[PDB]
Design an enzyme around this catalytic site. Structure first.
Site, mmCIF file in Angstrom:
data_model
loop_
_atom_site.group_PDB
_atom_site.id
_atom_site.type_symbol
_atom_site.label_atom_id
_atom_site.label_comp_id
_atom_site.label_asym_id
_atom_site.label_seq_id
_atom_site.Cartn_x
_atom_site.Cartn_y
_atom_site.Cartn_z
ATOM 1 N N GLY D 136 1.426 -1.307 0.254
ATOM 2 C CA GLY D 136 -0.203 0.148 0.135
ATOM 3 C C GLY D 136 1.020 1.022 -0.276
ATOM 4 N N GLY D 137 0.006 2.321 0.721
ATOM 5 C CA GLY D 137 0.979 3.292 0.609
ATOM 6 C C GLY D 137 0.728 4.606 -0.492
ATOM 7 C CE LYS D 138 5.520 4.914 -4.771
ATOM 8 N NZ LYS D 138 6.552 4.689 -3.628
ATOM 9 C CG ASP D 155 1.727 -7.567 -5.085
ATOM 10 O OD1 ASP D 155 2.342 -6.194 -5.218
ATOM 11 O OD2 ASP D 155 1.796 -8.379 -4.142
ATOM 12 N NE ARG D 160 4.854 -7.328 0.203
ATOM 13 C CZ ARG D 160 5.490 -8.542 -0.833
ATOM 14 N NH1 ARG D 160 5.288 -9.178 -2.024
ATOM 15 N NH2 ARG D 160 6.612 -9.225 -0.420
ATOM 16 N N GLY D 189 1.722 -8.838 -13.706
ATOM 17 C CA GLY D 189 1.792 -7.971 -14.258
ATOM 18 C C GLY D 189 2.179 -7.442 -15.980
ATOM 19 C CG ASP D 206 7.263 0.976 -6.193
ATOM 20 O OD1 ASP D 206 8.276 0.391 -6.522
ATOM 21 O OD2 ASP D 206 6.637 1.497 -5.700
ATOM 22 C CB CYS D 261 12.480 1.790 -3.460
ATOM 23 S SG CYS D 261 13.480 -0.262 -3.341
HETATM 24 C C1 LIG Z 1 8.941 -2.735 -4.105
HETATM 25 S S1 LIG Z 1 6.823 -3.546 -4.006
HETATM 26 C C2 LIG Z 1 6.053 -1.819 -4.243
HETATM 27 C C3 LIG Z 1 6.066 -1.246 -3.276
HETATM 28 C C4 LIG Z 1 4.716 -0.991 -3.072
HETATM 29 N N1 LIG Z 1 4.173 -0.138 -4.132
HETATM 30 C C5 LIG Z 1 4.502 0.306 -1.703
HETATM 31 O O1 LIG Z 1 5.182 1.196 -2.019
HETATM 32 O O2 LIG Z 1 5.348 0.016 -0.497
HETATM 33 C C6 LIG Z 1 7.001 -4.129 -5.253
HETATM 34 C C7 LIG Z 1 6.174 -5.460 -5.451
HETATM 35 O O3 LIG Z 1 5.830 -5.771 -7.432
HETATM 36 C C8 LIG Z 1 4.948 -7.366 -6.776
HETATM 37 N N2 LIG Z 1 5.558 -8.132 -8.350
HETATM 38 C C9 LIG Z 1 7.069 -8.762 -8.236
HETATM 39 N N3 LIG Z 1 6.653 -8.744 -9.477
HETATM 40 C C10 LIG Z 1 5.504 -8.897 -10.247
HETATM 41 C C11 LIG Z 1 4.604 -9.132 -11.532
HETATM 42 N N4 LIG Z 1 5.843 -10.026 -12.030
HETATM 43 N N5 LIG Z 1 3.547 -8.861 -11.451
HETATM 44 C C12 LIG Z 1 2.905 -8.209 -10.726
HETATM 45 N N6 LIG Z 1 3.796 -7.961 -9.029
HETATM 46 C C13 LIG Z 1 4.843 -7.891 -9.250
HETATM 47 C C14 LIG Z 1 6.421 -7.576 -5.755
HETATM 48 O O4 LIG Z 1 5.677 -9.043 -5.558
HETATM 49 C C15 LIG Z 1 6.607 -6.639 -4.598
HETATM 50 O O5 LIG Z 1 4.828 -6.849 -3.607
#
Ligand SMILES: C[S@@+](CC[C@H](N)C(=O)[O-])C[C@H]1O[C@@H](n2cnc3c(N)ncnc32)[C@H](O)[C@@H]1O
Ligand SMILES: [Mg+2]
Ligand SMILES: [Mg+2]
Ligand SMILES: [Mg+2]
Ligand SMILES: [Mg+2]
Ligand SMILES: [Mg+2]
Ligand SMILES: [Mg+2]
Ligand SMILES: [Mg+2]
Ligand SMILES: [Mg+2]
Ligand SMILES: [Mg+2]
Ligand SMILES: [Mg+2]
Ligand SMILES: [Mg+2]
Ligand SMILES: [Mg+2]
Ligand SMILES: [Mg+2]
Ligand SMILES: [Mg+2]
Ligand SMILES: [Mg+2]
Ligand SMILES: [Mg+2]
Ligand SMILES: [Mg+2]
Ligand SMILES: [Mg+2]
Ligand SMILES: [Mg+2]
Ligand SMILES: [Mg+2]
Ligand SMILES: [Mg+2]
Ligand SMILES: [Mg+2]
Ligand SMILES: [Mg+2]
Ligand SMILES: [Mg+2]
Ligand SMILES: [Mg+2]
Ligand SMILES: [Mg+2]
Ligand SMILES: [Mg+2]
Ligand SMILES: [Mg+2]
Ligand SMILES: [Mg+2]
Ligand SMILES: [Mg+2]
Ligand SMILES: [Mg+2]
Ligand SMILES: [Mg+2]
Ligand SMILES: [Mg+2]
Ligand SMILES: [Mg+2]
Lengths: 238, 136, 95, 335
Positions: D136-138, D155, D160, D189, D206, D261
């Site tokens: 979350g957050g964003k 996601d 998560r 995604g 993100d 990040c």
């Molecule tokens: C760095 S986190 C995003 C941070 C979040 N938006 C925040 O600000 O708190 C990236 C997320 O993308 C997910 N993710 C990884 N590969 C993915 C994919 N192919 N399709 C969708 N989500 C994916 C990860 O599991 C993770 O929860």
RNA sequence: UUAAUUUAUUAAUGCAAACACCUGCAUUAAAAAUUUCGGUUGGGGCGACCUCGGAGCAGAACCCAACCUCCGAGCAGUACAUGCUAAGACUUCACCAGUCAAAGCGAACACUCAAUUGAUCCA
RNA sequence: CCUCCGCAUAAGCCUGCGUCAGAUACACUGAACUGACAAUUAACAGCCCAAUAUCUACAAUCAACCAACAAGUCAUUAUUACCCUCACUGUCAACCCAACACAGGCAUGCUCAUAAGGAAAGGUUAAAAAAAGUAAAAGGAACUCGGCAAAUCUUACCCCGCCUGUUUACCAAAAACAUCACCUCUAGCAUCACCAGUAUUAGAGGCACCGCCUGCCCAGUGAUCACUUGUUCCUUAAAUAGGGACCUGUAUGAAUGGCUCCACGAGGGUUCAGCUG
RNA sequence: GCUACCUAAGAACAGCUAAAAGAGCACACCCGUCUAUGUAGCAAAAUAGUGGGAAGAUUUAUAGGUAGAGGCGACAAACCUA
RNA sequence: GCUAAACCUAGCCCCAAACCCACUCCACCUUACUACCAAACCUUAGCCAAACCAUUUACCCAAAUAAAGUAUAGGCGAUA
């Protein structure tokens, strides 16, 4: 066990006394001290460490003549046979002591500090500050225990009120009563430390057995780890 | 007992030599009034985390400085990456700054030369470090 | 269990069984449900009711418990006010 | 653990970030290891007026309000309020509580995380996508604006996304989270392009990053674990795929923001450059990178920026303002 | 040994007793003492795994595909009769556990979710 | 024909090849087997000593020069007391410790090859294979993991360890251990070890002769001395930053690392020349 | 009573070269490098040859001591009646 | 038909009952069996059982039986 100490003589004599080697064993028969055993046979010469010992039916300062200065197997220092009146005794010889030398033993504390000749034994009160001394006593009339190794000299540092600070050869100060007697000068056999054993065989003659072949990790322990600090150990380089 | 406990801790727990102990007493008399726990912790800090051998502690007069000051200077340098704790082998990639230029120098001098950071950065770091120790 | 005592040369009761089970004279053994006191907050009222029950044991379980107790525990008892008095005898049981 | 995973992160960052940042790296290094400064994003569905007054009592200032004032000396996402303490203040906000309405007053999150949301120039009645919403957050900030006609949360990990449901329930009322009003999905995604193309006005991407702040502190499920070393290697490839997928879903004339990040230029600049190249060749679609020089200038007061980025803006942590690293690149699909 | 359990022993310290030693208690170290070193994965290092739910997966009652290839769970939300009681049943191939429920009493006009979990002792 | 054995003492054993008469691991009807009978005789050796004080500095080495070091193997006197004598025990053997009449183990003196002590071949034949020797044309390591063995008696090196020495009795003798020298740590002291010692000592350790290099976290600049700094107090709500005191009787650092080198080695490797089945 | 170490009081070491020695050659004596023999053997570790040392940190006889949660060790986990 | 085979009784076992032993002479704690000279009292542990093991794990104590394997104890387990 069946061990009986050889140190049975009750009467002082200048005759060399037959002594028994221990081997570093006890009365029990087990080893307490390692690296001792089986050198050259030795005979013990009894040493009068009480320099101010007045003769029977005699008192006050007395003089003695040095008969000979002789090697001693039992100690590093040379010994001297000294005669006074009708008594002969073994004492620890000074650095510069020869046959024919005359040495004085006094219990007189002088108001004016007497001149310190090398051979003579005086109370520390009599002796001037800064004089090299040897064969000191911790207590009055106890006997010499402290500076009696070869080429060793104590320094009379200061004299306060019936007390005297002397410097033992290990550079440690000691409090002594002024009434205690010390011998002036350095002990005989200077450059004893400068001697070279040369071969393993010589130590065996001196009665020193070789050190253990076992390898020890360290003489000192490892520092004990406190509760929060453990992560800071065992860092691996990459 | 107070004097005896201090020298015992240094000789036994801290494994300092008799000569070293005397020098510590001669140079840092403040160790005697200091708590045993704190004194032990201070030594532990230099020995492991800062990777300082026994002779260096005695020479650099480390036990003289307050524990608080040691934490602020070292942790800042460690987090900056300028100070790196020695490994098992004891070798460091980049030689660590000497305790002369860490503790002996002033706050300003330390920041100018060693830390290479402005004062305002260090001031705010004090507050964060002070807080961290509160939770422990 | 102890088949023969060192002191008396008698079979011994396992005291664990006595602490946990009731024997009815007819041969049945009664027990509480396991975990009936445990984590009641996360359990449904129906489940809680199921737990708060006195339940009979298997034939095999009964046979085990019989062997683990002496004859004393199997005797007819005429307790003054026994809540399980009626349950001691079986009625209208065919084989 | 025989060898901590957090130690690998330090080793990894030191060899690459030192050469990347030079003399700036020490300053970044100390900030990363120190405690993160937090901003309170006020829930608009809650009593915004009352919370604002309450936080003002704690000597906290709304930076975005000040930012809007200096904006006009496109427009940023409206209806966003984030209070942060003054430079050099280590003060912590009290834990958030439920409100009178039954929704929590404010959300404690990294202030730098709002910048991608602010960069995306949200307008009322815009269909918006978030490819990686969880935890979350964003995505919460998207809803706070109230300009989202249809919001899609995605996601890969349902673990998560479950956490997001909890955040959404706590902060956003059921009324706002109606049918197809807010859509939550747990699908891949990467395959979003073929799912729906030319759908969304705005897409927030993100991608998974090395999580520099998180990797140094938290041992559990660290990316720098030797078991996950294969994931790190394929991560630059994976990041490009996701950014490309977001671009396909975007209508022509629409805008996307790429948020990462990490400090690494490999996962920041090359991913953006790579995605444009991939899209221009394979799908023959042109992307124009929108300059954020004005955007960086406005937010200089609160956030320090690394002024050496070819594309996008990188927020570096400073010990004065310990905000977690955030690389946001805004770009428009011309065709 | 940086495994667990100890300090009976030794040494020191403090507090009692006694008017320095001895004795009792406690603390700190040294020296030892007793005991152990689960399971899967060539074997070894770095890893992973052990419980629960879903799919490949028994094409159609039930059960059944080891090993493997993938996924997920260790919550949460709404009630506050999520009270009490009671026929008959199901059952993860045993047991322990687990599941459904008529009628009745009392109320009102036995919640959603695939898992979302832990016996005995003991406190 | 052999003698690398013998004779004696010590230690050990205990009648264990003397006489007579018998039955009967090669055998003599004879044996060391059975039974009976006999025998080792003290001068040699063992078995010693009245008391109480007291005496005993000066090796041995042909003990004289000379030279030492590890410092040594042997002495009485004064006074009292004292008068009876040759007892007792070992004395044999071809022998002991090794389960045996065992190619083994076994101290000393004399004999250093015997004046003493013994016999390698039951008889035959002259196969193979096996063992130990001797001789061998021409060649001379071509053999082989390796000049192992034999013959011949040899040079120049390299590595390792300074050296003599010690170690797994019964598969490892070495590069392992010890070792002179060096270094670290601990200890200011008497009547049972250390030690009848005392810091040039003693104990616990490391390394390995010597020889040559390798040594500062002692507070910084400026001209022994001023001044912020370091350390402690107080003021200050408390601090920031101000008021006062001290750092000027001394410090050395490495149980650190490298480097050749003389001698030596049943060590590991290479090599010259000869030599030999 | 073997062996490891020690204690007491003993004994042994030819000849040749050497400024003269934990020196060299080399007996006796101690040890066990290498090969061959032997492998229920002469022998539960021997024999023959060849070797290392042989005035010394040497070898050896006698009596005594240290005892298993231990002794003793020039550490080989050596030896403490095969 | 050789080697062999065959045997019955020395003695023993468990009980009962009953409370046993003890100088020809000489020698015998020193190197025992050698005529004759200046100091004892002091918790057993462990195997084993608990399917490991670490608290724990029957062992005579004043005479049968019964109370009763009951009350009790116990990693409230094994068991006592
Ligand atoms: C760095 S986190 C995003 C941070 C979040 N938006 C925040 O600000 O708190 C990236 C997320 O993308 C997910 N993710 C990884 N590969 C993915 C994919 N192919 N399709 C969708 N989500 C994916 C990860 O599991 C993770 O929860
Ligand atoms: Mg001596
Ligand atoms: Mg050694
Ligand atoms: Mg069933
Ligand atoms: Mg199954
Ligand atoms: Mg109903
Ligand atoms: Mg006969
Ligand atoms: Mg005679
Ligand atoms: Mg003859
Ligand atoms: Mg013959
Ligand atoms: Mg023949
Ligand atoms: Mg032949
Ligand atoms: Mg030929
Ligand atoms: Mg060849
Ligand atoms: Mg040749
Ligand atoms: Mg060939
Ligand atoms: Mg040869
Ligand atoms: Mg020939
Ligand atoms: Mg050598
Ligand atoms: Mg030699
Ligand atoms: Mg040698
Ligand atoms: Mg040997
Ligand atoms: Mg051997
Ligand atoms: Mg050998
Ligand atoms: Mg060595
Ligand atoms: Mg050799
Ligand atoms: Mg002797
Ligand atoms: Mg000779
Ligand atoms: Mg020699
Ligand atoms: Mg020789
Ligand atoms: Mg030896
Ligand atoms: Mg070894
Ligand atoms: Mg070994
Ligand atoms: Mg044996
Ligand atoms: Mg067991």
């Amino acid at each position: 066990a069946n061990f009986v100490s050889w140190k049975s003589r009750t009467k002082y004599t200048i005759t060399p006394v037959k002594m028994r080697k221990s081997g570093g064993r006890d009365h029990t028969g087990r080893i307490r001290v390692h690296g001792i055993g089986g050198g050259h046979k030795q005979r013990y010469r009894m040493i009068d460490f009480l320099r101010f010992r007045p003769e029977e039916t005699k008192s006050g300062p007395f003089e003695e003549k040095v008969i000979q200065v002789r090697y001693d197997p039992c100690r590093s220092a040379d010994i001297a046979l000294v005669a006074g009146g009708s008594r002969k005794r073994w004492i620890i010889a000074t650095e510069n002591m020869q046959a024919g030398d005359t040495i004085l033993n006094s219990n007189h504390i002088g108001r004016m500090a007497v001149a310190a000749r090398e051979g003579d034994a005086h109370p520390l009160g009599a002796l001037p500050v800064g004089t090299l001394i040897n064969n000191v006593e911790s207590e009055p009339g106890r006997g010499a225990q402290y500076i009696r190794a070869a080429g060793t000299c104590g320094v009379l540092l200061r004299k306060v009120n019936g007390t005297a600070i002397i410097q033992l050869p290990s550079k440690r100060q000691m409090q002594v009563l002024e009434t205690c007697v010390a011998t002036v000068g350095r002990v005989s056999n200077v450059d004893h430390n400068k001697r070279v054993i040369g071969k393993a065989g010589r130590n065996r003659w001196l009665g020193k057995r070789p050190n253990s072949g076992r390898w020890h990790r360290k003489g000192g322990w490892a520092g004990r780890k406190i509760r929060p600090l453990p992560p800071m150990k065992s860092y691996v380089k990459l | 007992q107070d004097i005896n406990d201090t020298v015992r801790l240094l000789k036994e727990k801290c494994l300092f030599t008799v000569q070293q102990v005397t020098k510590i007493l001669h140079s840092c008399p403040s160790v005697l009034r200091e708590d045993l726990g704190q004194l032990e912790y201070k030594f532990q800090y230099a020995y492991f985390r800062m990777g300082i051998k026994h002779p260096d502690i005695v020479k650099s007069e480390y036990l003289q400085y307050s524990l608080t000051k040691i934490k602020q200077r070292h942790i800042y340098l460690e987090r900056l990456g300028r100070y790196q704790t020695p490994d098992k082998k004891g070798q460091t990639q980049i030689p660590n700054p000497l305790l002369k230029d860490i503790l002996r120098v002033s706050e300003a001098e330390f920041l100018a030369r060693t830390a290479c950071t402005s004062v305002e950065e260090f001031q705010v770091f004090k507050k964060l470090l002070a807080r961290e120790e509160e939770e422990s | 269990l102890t088949y023969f005592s060192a002191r008396k040369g008698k079979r011994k009761t396992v005291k664990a069984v006595i602490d946990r089970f009731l024997r009815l004279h007819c041969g049945l053994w009664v027990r509480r449900k396991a975990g009936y006191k445990k984590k009641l907050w996360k359990k449904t009222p129906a489940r809680k009711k199921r737990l708060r029950e006195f339940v009979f044991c298997n034939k095999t379980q009964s046979k085990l418990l019989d062997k683990m107790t002496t004859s004393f525990w199997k005797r007819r008892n005429w307790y003054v006010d026994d809540p399980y008095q009626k349950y001691h005898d079986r009625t209208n049981l065919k084989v | 653990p025989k060898f901590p995973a957090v130690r690998l992160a330090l080793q990894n960052f030191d060899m690459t970030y030192s050469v990347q940042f030079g003399d700036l790296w020490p300053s970044i290094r100390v900030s990363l290891l120190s405690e993160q400064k937090y901003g309170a994003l006020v829930n608009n569905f809650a009593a915004w007026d009352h919370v604002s007054a309450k936080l003002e009592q704690l000597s906290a200032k709304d930076f975005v309000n000040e930012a809007i004032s200096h904006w006009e000396l496109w427009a940023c996402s409206p209806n966003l309020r984030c209070f942060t303490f003054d430079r050099g203040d280590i003060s912590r906000f009290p834990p958030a509580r439920p409100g009178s309405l039954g929704v929590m007053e404010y959300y404690l999150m990294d202030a730098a995380s709002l910048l991608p949301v602010l960069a995306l120039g949200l307008q009322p009645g815009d269909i918006v996508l978030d490819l990686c919403a969880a935890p979350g957050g964003k995505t919460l900030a998207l809803l706070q604006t109230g300009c989202c006609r249809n919001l899609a949360a995605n996601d890969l990990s349902p673990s998560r996304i479950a956490r997001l449901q909890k955040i959404l329930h706590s902060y956003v009322p059921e009324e706002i989270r109606d049918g197809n009003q807010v859509r939550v999905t747990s699908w891949d995604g990467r395959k979003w392009g073929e799912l729906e193309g030319d759908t969304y006005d705005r897409v927030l991407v993100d991608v998974p990053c090395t999580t520099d702040r998180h990797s140094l502190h938290e041992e559990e499920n660290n990316i720098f674990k030797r078991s996950r070393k294969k994931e790190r290697q394929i991560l630059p490839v994976l990041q490009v795929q996701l950014l490309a997928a977001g671009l396909l879903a975007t209508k022509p004339g629409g805008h996307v923001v790429y948020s990462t990040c990490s400090l690494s230029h490999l996962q920041n600049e090359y991913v953006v450059q790579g995605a444009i190249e991939l899209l221009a060749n394979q799908y023959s679609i042109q992307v124009q990178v929108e300059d954020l020089t004005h955007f960086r200038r406005v937010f200089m007061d609160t956030f320090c920026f690394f002024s050496s980025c070819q594309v996008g803006e990188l927020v570096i942590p400073n010990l004065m303002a310990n905000f977690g690293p955030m690389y946001f690149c805004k770009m428009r699909r011309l065709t």
